[PDB]
Structure formats: C-alpha cells, structure tokens
C-alpha cells in the first residue's frame, strides 16, 4: 500500500522445495531503526557491486523497501509497528534482508523480531561463526572457532506464554497447578509470575533434520545436540532424545561403540559425521577450552541465543556476526546487532553483520560467485587494517574508516 | 543411624542470625562419588593444617561423615540415595561440606544436589570467581576478572515442574492452556513436553538483598541484575524490577541521573555502589570483552548456572572453582565439578575446588585466619608451578603432582 513494487524485476518462485531465482529478482529489505540508516546503504552498495562483478552485468537485484518498527509508524501511522503487508510480502517474494529493529516499551508490544519469526514460521535461526584473520579477539586462539549454530526458533520459553504476578490469570494457572495437578514445588505461590516452556517432537525433529542435512551438504565433521536435559528432562531432555532418534531413523545412525554417540555416513563424501550431545553449561566452558571439537551445533531457542552471543564475542565478531531465519516458504536474513541510537546517522558503525548476512542471502539464492566475492572483500579490508572504529580501537597500525568507506574498502578488496 | 557422631566436638549454634562457633565444632562432610574419594582426604588434611597453623592448637574441627549418593546405597541399602537424616544433620549442625555426587538414570530420581538445595531451602548459590596468578587461561587478560555470582537457588525452571510429551498430565495442562487460558502460541500441541518457570517477589528480593548486603560488607563497586527480561517479561523482567525496587526501598537507592541505574551509598565506606542491569545474552559477551565493569552479579537459577560456568572457564578455573549454598538456617559448601569416574582412586585430579570451598566455609565460621592461610597456600603452589595434571598440561616449566601431593604443596606455601 505504501510499498512501491519495482517496475523492472521479477519474483523468486518456489518450485517444490527449490528456489527459482530470475536474473533480476525483487528482494524486499527492511532498513532498520537506529544505525540501520547507516549500515543498510553500505550493504546495498557492496551487494550491487559484488553481483556486478560476478555476472558481468547479466544479473541485477531490484531492491524493494518494506517497513517494520519505528520507520513503519512514520509511514503508516503511530499505531503500526508491524504492518500486515510486510508479512505477506516476505512470504510472497521469498527472501528478504533486514537491519536492526526497535520494539517500544509501555505499549504491551512483544519483540517485533520474534513476531516476524513466529508469524512466518521461520523455524531455523542459522548463525555461522568463524574467525576472520586479523579481527581483534579477547581469546588467545580464535582461529580454532568455526561453528554453525542451528537454533530452534518456533518454541521454548520464547513462545511468550506467560502471566503477571498477582494477575487474575496467574492466580488461576497457579490454582490449576496446585489443586488439579498437585504441584507442591512452587516455593512462593503468591506474587508469582509464571512462564510456560513447550518442546514438541515435530519442533525439534524439523530443526535437527536441517542441521544434519547441512552437515552432509557441507561435509562438516559433527553435529552436537546441546541441552540442559539433566534438569529439564521433558523438554530439553526430550530434544536430545528426539535428535538422536531422528539421526538413527532417518540418517542411518550407528552406535560409536557403547554409545551414546552416533555415526552418520555422508552419502556423498563417505566420511562419518559424529552425532553427539553435551550439557549446556559445560558446553559454555568447552567452546572456550576446546573449540576445535565442535562444528555444527543444534539447540533450542534460549540456549542458541546464549551460545550464539558468547561465540560471536570470542572471535571478536560481536559486530560482524551474520544471521538467517529460515522456514520452508521464506527466509529473512539480518543484522544480528542492535540499533545503537547514539551513533545513528554518524556513519561510524560496522556494516559487517548485515553485509555478511547479505552474502548468506546470496548463497541461498544460488548466487555463490557474488557471495564469495563479498567474503573475499571482507577478509581483504580487515587484513589491510582498513577498518571502522570498533576494530581500530583494539588494533595498532590500523586506518580508521567510516561505515560507508568500509563498504568501499570491501568492494576494493573484491 | 549409621553416622557416628564425634565424641569430642560441639555443635555450632545459631543465636539469632549470628553463628556461635565453638573451638571444637562438629562439621559434617559428604565425601562424594567418583573423584570425591581423592579430593575430600586432601581437603580434610589442608583444612586441619590451616587451623593448626592459625590458632596454634586452640581450635580443632571434629569431622563427621554423612551420606548421599552412591556411597549412601552402600551404607543404608540399594534404594536410598538421599537419607532423611542427612537433611536433619545438615540443618542441626549448621555448616557442611561436600564432594561431587552421582544421581542415577533409569529410576526417576531428580538431581540429588538440587534436592538438597530445595529441601533445605538453601536459596543463595554463591560462586566467587577470581584469577589466581599463574593458572593457565584461554583468554588474554584473565586477571581482569573478579566477580561474585549470587544465583537464586529455589525457583526458576529448576523447580522441576514438568510433564512428559503424550503423557496424560501433559495432555491435561495443554488442554487447560488452550481451552481455559486460550493460548494460541503452542506451535505443535501434540507430542509436546511442558515446563513451568515460576518467579516470585519473595524469591527474588531475598536473593537480591543478600547480594547488595554482600557488596556493602565487602565494599564491592556494583551489583548487576542479569536477566532476559525483554523476552520473559513476567519472570525475568519481574526479577529485574523487584531488584531495583528493593535497592530503592531498603537501601535508599537514587537515580544515577535519568536512570535506570541506581546508586546505593555504602553505610560504612561512604562509597557508591552502582545497581545496574544487563540482558543475559549481551552479558555473556560483556564478561569476555569488558570484565572489569562487573563485580557482584545477581541473577536467576539457570542464568547463574551458565554465567558461573562460563566465567570459571575464562580464568582457567573449571577445576578450582569454589561454591556455597546458603540458606537462613544452614549452609552447604561444595566441590563444583563432577565425579569424573575414569580418574577415581588414581590420586590425580585437582583438589582445588573443594579446598577453596573449605576456605569459604571457614570464612563463614568466622575463622578468617585459617581461611587466609589456605588462599596463601593456593597462590603459592600455583605460582611455584607445583601443580596437578590439568594445569601442568598447559604449562611449560611445571612440576607434575598427584592430588594428595598438591595438598601438601598448599600446606607448604602457607
Ligand atoms: Mg542473541
Ligand atoms: Mg553449573
């Protein structure tokens, strides 16, 4: 309604599982709030330059601005933070990319990003974290990290099923729990908020199936189910058991003698993928002390939220970390950082995260050459120490660049 | 009944909040399973040596072996993993110390440690993590870490209120949620496990009150409430708000202009303690990138479980990390690592964690001099590079010591 759908440009089609990408596809983008005003122009410019370089003018993207968050209230009216047509348009045009979003407090509006994820059933939150040589890191050996996080995105305590302390509703489910379910384990039943954590069989098998499949397709060495199953037996513990069960039943998993670990043979390279599990708090130590043991990681919503963030900080990538939200009908790639409003409009923040989510987008479209040119550009700029303020603070011998100038530096190292 | 209560030795008394410790107190200890057989003898010997040194023979501890876990089935019978008298004896004798415990799988027996914590209402899990100079660390600057974790121990998803997928009970609470509570947010209501996360006002105020009080008594610079309140508004978000509310109402907190942060003035040193909050996934990055900003940490059960573990791994202390479980009537100090059965009986693992939980025990008894002699001994042994295998693997120029020999090395550096 306020989106101006591009004159040239053609819709991507989903021809039974497979994406059918034209040479001039229309790609929706949500600019983002705060520093989205800085990083999204830098990403449109380097993506455009990378497909110009790779396909020598044969392919072109027709970018289409759609709206969510704060810019949405400025376009449609004060009350509309998530327009219904943004949801239809992501679904229709199949892939989209976004900058950081603001959700308001004081209005009873739950996280707009989690609303997108659940409303479009984008059940895979894919977070790849690897070290880019030369980025300043807090740990001694960040180069030992090359993991890919498959975080379940549609259930867990993130579903948002909760009630306020002293509210009538909370009173009522605490009454049901104590009287009809006989729970004697609530220490203080009065002035008590209640949260519901659900974990289903379809929810975890569709996420784990995607993780094992990614390991076969990219012949990764292992898939680690991380969970806190010793304490949460029927949600987290069920996740781990449904994950091992699916590796056995669908991928022909075999005991690595005695168990619990399984072996899956890659149907293409002939190698064996270890399917293993580790408890979540011990995993938080293991990624620091033994990061070379792990590769593809499958976990639930909250655990994936924490694992992702801790892992991005150890390779020095809190501001260059990419992210994808993938469902069966569409996908939404994104800047994984926040809006940082203090710096907005100053052209100073790292455009790295949304640019690396744009290469994930391209790679997903099958435009691998363009995707490869962007990570070449990225490795070059960082190695040339021609970098933005967040990196330059920690580097000795670096040249300080603006957000936009680092965009040009990526195009220059392509 | 099978505990032989010591002939010499007198019970510690609780004279209205205050502990009344005799010169010869009876202290219960649970040896532990696995490597408990190695580390608990090393701790009894260095504690004994430290109080012998500090009080020149005037004070003596009368150790009393009590039973839980696997050794309990060997003493009382196959069916008894947690004897009822262990609970009465910890409560009666007021302080106790324990090694690592095994909980069995296949019997429907929930974690024995969480049973101790909840059954005795030991609502504070106190975890201090600081760097001991010379321990091998994965990060560049571990010496910047000196934090004290106040983890709420009696509620959260750890309460153990959950139901199995496809069980009649799960069917029933999913029916109540959908029909009587009208929840439309469960993606897959079939084959769905359910967990209940409770968070009450009394539960978080009693934990936060203990954290702020510890900051005043040890004049620590700040108290950080960590939570994932943007997603879990009525449990995690309520925790943060009840924490700020208690700092205002009981400690005379004032806005550090504009807020949300508060200032508490230490009634003794005159300094100002910053009361702040940070979101839990961003905190996991912040402890790596800016560890000097944080000091005392107050958080809920699961978050404290993760924070504790990640923090112990960055200062190279996964095997020397101390821990206390403190309630109003008693306390239970502990080895925070597992049973490691492969190495049990070999005299090779680090006795560091249970020995440093024994100095926390002593310090809590008011036997500060003895406590101080143990951390002096610890700093000496580690600095002398006269160390056990887990440290020696990562050190160049170290002498390898057995579990028991490192005990003697601590006594020697006292
Ligand atoms: Mg996150
Ligand atoms: Mg732990």
From Swiss-Prot, chains A, B:
GO terms for molecular function: guanosine tetraphosphate binding; isocitrate dehydrogenase (NADP+) activity; magnesium ion binding; NAD binding. Its cofactor is Mg(2+); Mn(2+). NADP(+) binds at residues 102, 337-343, 350, 389, 393. The modification N6-succinyllysine is found at residues 98, 240. NCBIfam families: PRK07006.1, prok_nadp_idh. Catalyzes the oxidative decarboxylation of isocitrate to 2-oxoglutarate and carbon dioxide with the concomitant reduction of NADP(+). Belongs to the isocitrate and isopropylmalate dehydrogenases family. This is Isocitrate dehydrogenase [NADP]. It comes from Escherichia coli (strain K12). The gene is icd.
